[PDB]
Design a protein around this ligand. Structure first.
Ligand SMILES: COc1cccc(CC(=O)O)c1
Lengths: 300, 237
């Protein structure tokens, strides 16, 4: 079990760690998050009390280094950093743990929610979507735009999700216009799965990361990416059976976790009605259809 | 964006544009079977592709054989239309290719957009105008070439005959849409108006009678009356 220690908390802030959150008051003696489960990526995220504008945060994996958080009064935010001196870092964390200045990652033993939301998410792929190679962790916030959004403005600060566009030459084989537009199996299986992602695990990883950035930061371009990746599968008549069963589980846990009060802005009515009730896969997402119908029957 | 009454003169500027109407592509007769069920029999159709500035009409005849063994024909008809319009554009020299294609029905937008991906600079636009191009098969010479076709065929016409020698393309289009609206609202009456006077004939190389300017004013008035009438007979006013 690993720790993300904090120098101090000089400004009042709501701190998120994965699906959990807690309020820290201005100058409260708060020195970290301990008992973080090894084996998963994690996200530590922030919303300042005085400017709820800009949720921001950091994706990280404690197996890759010793990370600490410290408030920068010039840039006005909590920054993740890496300490290369391991003994020094162990000594700092041990001191905070003895003075009981940390909150404990509050995982219930029965609870597989975080695993289920991050099953295919790998830090190495996060770092290719979020390019900042000098750090082992990745910063994301509410305003960052995607490569596709920028085509339709700073490249270094963009989310390099895989571009999906149903009315594009990449999606439509010359001579199969009607076929490929009405059944996207070519685009899913040859262009995207075989060609770009290489396997369905990497596809699901990007889909899961896009959902999590939409939910935790209200990142609009990530929400677009999540829905596009769902729609591409549901609009394909030919999908491997293991992928459909896994997609149903993925979406089930995403819909289960979504704040009930954000459903209006994080769920696209057109995509979900099309996917559950009109698409080729309308009968292939039993778990997802059942939770959607019981939790958000208004959207449908 | 969409084409409507506000940007109407744009049709007659010097940017090449085509209207595409697909309402006569897939045509059927509905009939009873010996068992008392209902079935359809396709008949030949046509794509109506029109340059409103020049009157040039590219009439692609759709022979019933293109439907043989196909399912979901009303959906296929939109994609077939888009395939044929795309092939027509590619067949034209670059300086004759349109800068815009206006579709009369919004369901043609995605099929045409997908078929024209190779032409990113050609704008595909809908329209808010309710244009009467479905009545093109009430023009006798157009109906005749469609029904006589035994194979796919493209036939070129000028739907304005020689009117542009005497009038502008705005006025020619207005005359065409009035004639077609009348033929659409009461075909029998409209055709009676156009031909009642046997001394006015249709030239072999024309679609409409050889009216003088004064006779066109009379004809045009008779068509407006017909349309307003029918609007009464219909609504009782
Ligand atoms: C607050 O946790 C840590 C851990 C390692 C280094 C630091 C920064 C320091 O040396 O003060 C902080």
């Amino acid at each position: 079990m690993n720790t993300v220690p904090f120098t101090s908390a000089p400004i009042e802030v709501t701190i998120g760690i994965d699906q959990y959150s807690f309020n820290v008051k201005e100058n409260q003696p708060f020195h970290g998050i301990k008992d973080i489960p090894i084996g998963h990526v994690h996200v530590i995220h922030f919303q300042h009390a005085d400017n709820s504008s800009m949720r921001y945060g950091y994706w990280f994996d404690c197996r890759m280094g010793n990370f600490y958080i410290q408030y920068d009064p010039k840039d006005g935010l909590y920054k993740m950093m890496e300490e290369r001196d391991g003994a020094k870092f162990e000594n700092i964390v041990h001191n905070f743990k003895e003075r009981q200045m940390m909150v404990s990652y509050p995982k219930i033993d029965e609870d597989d929610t975080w695993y289920n939301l991050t099953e295919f998410v790998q830090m190495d792929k996060i770092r290719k979507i979020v390019r900042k190679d000098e750090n082992q962790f990745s910063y994301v916030d509410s305003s960052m735009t995607t490569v596709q959004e920028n085509e339709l403005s700073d490249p270094a600060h963009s989310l390099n999700y895989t571009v999906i566009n149903f009315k594009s030459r990449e999606a439509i084989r010359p001579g199969h216009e009607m076929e490929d537009f009405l059944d996207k199996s070519y685009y899913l299986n040859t262009v995207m799965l075989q060609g770009i992602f290489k396997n369905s695990s990497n596809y699901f990883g990007e889909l899961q990361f896009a959902f999590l950035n939409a939910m935790f930061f209200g990142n609009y371009g990530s929400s677009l990416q999540w829905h596009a990746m769902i729609e591409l599968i549901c609009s394909s008549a030919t999908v491997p059976k293991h992928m459909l069963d896994k997609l149903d589980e993925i979406l089930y846990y995403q819909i289960k976790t979504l704040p009930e009060q954000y459903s209006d802005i994080l769920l696209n009515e057109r995509v979900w009605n099309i996917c559950l009730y009109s698409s080729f896969q309308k009968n292939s997402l039993h778990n997802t259809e059942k939770i959607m119908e019981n939790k958000y029957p208004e959207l449908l | 964006g969409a084409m409507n009454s506000s940007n109407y003169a744009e049709l007659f500027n010097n940017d090449i544009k085509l209207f595409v109407d697909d309402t006569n592509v897939y045509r059927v007769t509905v009939h009873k079977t010996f068992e008392g069920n209902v079935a359809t029999k396709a008949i030949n159709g046509c794509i109506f592709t029109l340059n409103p500035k020049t009157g040039h009409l590219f009439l692609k005849i759709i022979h019933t054989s293109v439907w043989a063994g196909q399912k979901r024909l009303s959906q296929l008809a939109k994609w077939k239309t888009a395939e044929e319009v795309s092939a027509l554009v590619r067949s034209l020299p670059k300086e004759e290719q349109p800068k815009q294609i206006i579709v009369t029905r919004k369901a043609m937008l995605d099929p045409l957009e997908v078929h024209m991906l190779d032409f990113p600079n050609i704008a595909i636009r809908p329209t808010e105008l309710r244009l009467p191009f479905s009545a093109a098969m009430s023009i006798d010479k157009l109906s005749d070439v469609v029904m006589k076709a035994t194979e796919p065929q493209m036939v070129l016409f000028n739907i304005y005959d020689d009117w542009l020698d005497r009038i502008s393309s705005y006025t020619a289009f207005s005359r065409l849409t009035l004639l077609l609206r009348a033929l659409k609202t009461n075909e029998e009456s409209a055709k009676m108006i156009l031909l009642s006077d046997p001394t006015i004939t249709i030239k072999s190389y024309h679609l409409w009678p050889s009216f003088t300017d004064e006779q066109w004013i009379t004809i045009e008035s008779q068509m407006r009356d017909l349309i307003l009438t029918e609007y009464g007979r219909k609504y009782n006013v």
